[PDB]
From TrEMBL, chain A:
One of its GO terms (biological process) is L-threonine catabolic process. The modification N6-(pyridoxal phosphate)lysine is found at residue 58. This is Threonine synthase. GO terms for molecular function: L-serine ammonia-lyase activity; pyridoxal phosphate binding; threonine deaminase activity; threonine synthase activity. Its EC number is 4.2.3.1. It comes from Bacillus spizizenii (Bacillus subtilis subsp. spizizenii). Pyridoxal 5'-phosphate binds at residues 56, 84, 184-188, 313. Catalyzes the gamma-elimination of phosphate from L-phosphohomoserine and the beta-addition of water to produce L-threonine. Keywords: Amino-acid biosynthesis, Lyase, Pyridoxal phosphate, Threonine biosynthesis. It comes from the Bacteria. Pathway: Amino-acid biosynthesis; L-threonine biosynthesis; L-threonine from L-aspartate: step 5/5.
TrEMBL record, chain B:
Pyridoxal 5'-phosphate binds at residues 54, 82, 176-180, 305. Catalyzes the gamma-elimination of phosphate from L-phosphohomoserine and the beta-addition of water to produce L-threonine. It comes from Bacillus spizizenii (Bacillus subtilis subsp. spizizenii). This is Threonine synthase. GO terms for biological process: isoleucine biosynthetic process; L-serine catabolic process; L-threonine catabolic process; threonine biosynthetic process. SUPFAM superfamilies: Tryptophan synthase beta subunit-like PLP-dependent enzymes (SSF53686). Keywords: Amino-acid biosynthesis, Lyase, Pyridoxal phosphate, Threonine biosynthesis. It catalyses: O-phospho-L-homoserine + H2O = L-threonine + phosphate. The modification N6-(pyridoxal phosphate)lysine is found at residue 56.
């Protein structure tokens, strides 16, 4: 396995002049969750994108966007980020010998992502505004500067991210009934749908129902209005004006899917559920896909017996502070005695 | 699944459950820029992509699968580090309880469902009581003395051979308790005798403040920023020594400054982020290339044992890249961007 550009070049806008950039991204596990599957009465798998080199699915788009930006002659890339896009941008820039400038919302990106941006060598600019404010600035600057924009409005980002749908079909042996996915800036749900349509066209696989889930306090698509003050403890998807809004809606309509919302309480519960029941640790915003499966299994929007693939978009180590916060452990102190300890259990 | 992939090398029976979190098969990444600068062909085995973020997962999936096979219903260890996280995730995946005993970060382990119990002793007291409990109950001990952890961990050497297409000249690897260097060596020997691959020189690296094997003396209070390898009395000490001996290798030491320098270097130059303890393998490669013990033109695999996200505090603390705080205003941001 030598990275996405090599593996899927047949589906990518790459030429012999594209730099052979890779951090061995892609090819992530599709993990069957038999306990949750039996509890829910469905066949549930998780695409664990936390295994990608910078710990999220953003690596898929970033390797494409950075390579094309280099192929186009740039020495500098820029993005706004809730943390995972900036971490991917900074790593691939470092790998590609390019400068990386990132604009992040002060106090609103997970601590692991800040460590990454710092430990990849990005020029980090923190603003008092939110992600939506940062993206507006970054797009404005890149219109007027010799700096390549690598946010998801760069179409090369979606070309890389659609490979995830290719893998899901290859790993499941068929397309799933449901692709459940978190929605922040909405590029990823759009990319998966493009991937499923291209695979349907080339290989005959069926078309999943695209089921996206915003966080309630940032569910701009669900509310059908721009959210000027989005909030959620799942700061990855704390995004109130998704730049791929229309593409996401088109993906739900064309796939007979839906973009739904889940509450923060529901997110945190799914967050603990997969770690406790299956040994799978994903960051809170990723667990919106699992909260969404729980919500729609109950309502019947996901019927029993469905083959469901939920995307866990980011590693749980991205956000140590949420895990520390909700896992209040005040361990009992016991005498050093076999009977004391065994009896307490 | 690692157990499935390598069952011919593993104590797998028809009764072994198919336990997996899809650990293993981790990337082996060529570092072309560092390679050019050093005059070697340098690859890194990036074990931080394992499920809990450490190579430990290799050994824990094997130990827990065997524990479940025997009919235990609980896993127990005394630890606070990556061991506790790995044991707890595989316990949860195996549908088993997990108990961690600590002397008076654990959040990941607790997320996986580990029950934390503190005792009024030191870590030695904790390991002693864990062993006594496990000897008398259906609670399996998964501290480092559990042999199945070495068996699991040896698969990393099989992967390196299959990923390179040959054994490397040099396997550079951190040494904490020294389980890992012995697992890799055992794996190379088995792969050599079965498939004809060559035998690498095993090059282990301790942090100088915790370098018990290098100093040939138990270090009572070991020190280093690299918490993963702050082990003052390596449990697999002699096994590691014989591994370096059988393989014409060496166990060496690196300073914290060297570790931190490698830490920052692989991240800035190659986009590869590993936890500080892991970067001892890179610091040692730098040190032994400069000393000629790694000759120019060697094919070298350095093992990056853990995810850099394991330790965000060191990353921020030691870096001089500090985020600059700017008004939400394009003009002031453009002017800084040229500034
Ligand atoms: C972990 C995680 N999950 C889901 C999403 C949302 O995916 P989307 O709908 O935007 O394609 C993000 C987005 N992170 C971006 C916005 C960032 O890091 O800047 C994310 O980091
Ligand atoms: C456990 C660990 C080590 C030490 O490996 P040993 O087998 O004890 O020599 C090094 N780095 C990380 C990240 C670890 O988890």
């Amino acid at each position: 396995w030598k990275g996405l550009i090599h593996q899927y070049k047949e589906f990518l806008p790459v030429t012999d002049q594209t730099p052979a950039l890779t951090l061995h991204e892609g090819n992530t596990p599709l993990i069957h969750l038999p306990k949750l599957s039996e509890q829910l009465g469905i066949e549930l798998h998780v695409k664990t994108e936390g295994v990608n080199p910078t710990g999220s699915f953003k690596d898929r788009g970033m390797v494409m966007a950075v390579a094309k930006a280099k192929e186009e002659g740039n020495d500098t890339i820029m993005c706004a980020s809730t943390g995972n896009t900036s971490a991917a941008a900074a790593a691939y820039a470092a790998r590609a010998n390019m400068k990386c400038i990132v604009i992040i919302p002060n106090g609103k990106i997970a601590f692991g992502k800040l460590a990454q941006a710092v430990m990849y060598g990005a020029e980090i600019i923190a603003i008092d505004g939110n992600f939506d404010d940062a993206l507006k600035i970054v797009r404005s600057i890149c219109e007027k500067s010799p700096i390549a924009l690598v946010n998801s409005v760069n179409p090369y980002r979606l070309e890389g991210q659609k490979t995830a749908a290719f893998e899901v079909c290859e790993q499941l042996g068929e397309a799933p009934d449901v692709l459940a996915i978190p929605v922040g800036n909405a590029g990823n749900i759009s990319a998966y749908w493009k991937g499923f349509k291209e695979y349907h066209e080339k290989n005959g696989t069926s078309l999943p129902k695209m089921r996206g889930f915003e966080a309630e306090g940032s569910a701009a698509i669900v509310r059908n209005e721009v959210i000027e003050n989005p909030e959620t403890i799942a700061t990855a998807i704390r995004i109130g004006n998704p730049a791929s809004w229309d593409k996401a809606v088109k993906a739900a309509e064309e796939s007979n899917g839906k973009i739904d919302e889940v509450t923060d309480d529901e997110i945190l519960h799914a967050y603990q559920l997969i770690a406790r029941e299956e040994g799978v640790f994903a960051e809170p915003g990723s667990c919106a896909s699992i909260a969404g499966v729980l919500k729609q299994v109950k309502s019947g929007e996901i019927p029993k017996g469905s083959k469901v693939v939920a995307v866990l978009t980011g590693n749980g180590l991205k956000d140590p502070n949420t895990a520390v916060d909700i896992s209040e452990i005040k361990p009992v102190t016991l005498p050093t005695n076999e009977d004391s300890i065994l009896e307490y259990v």
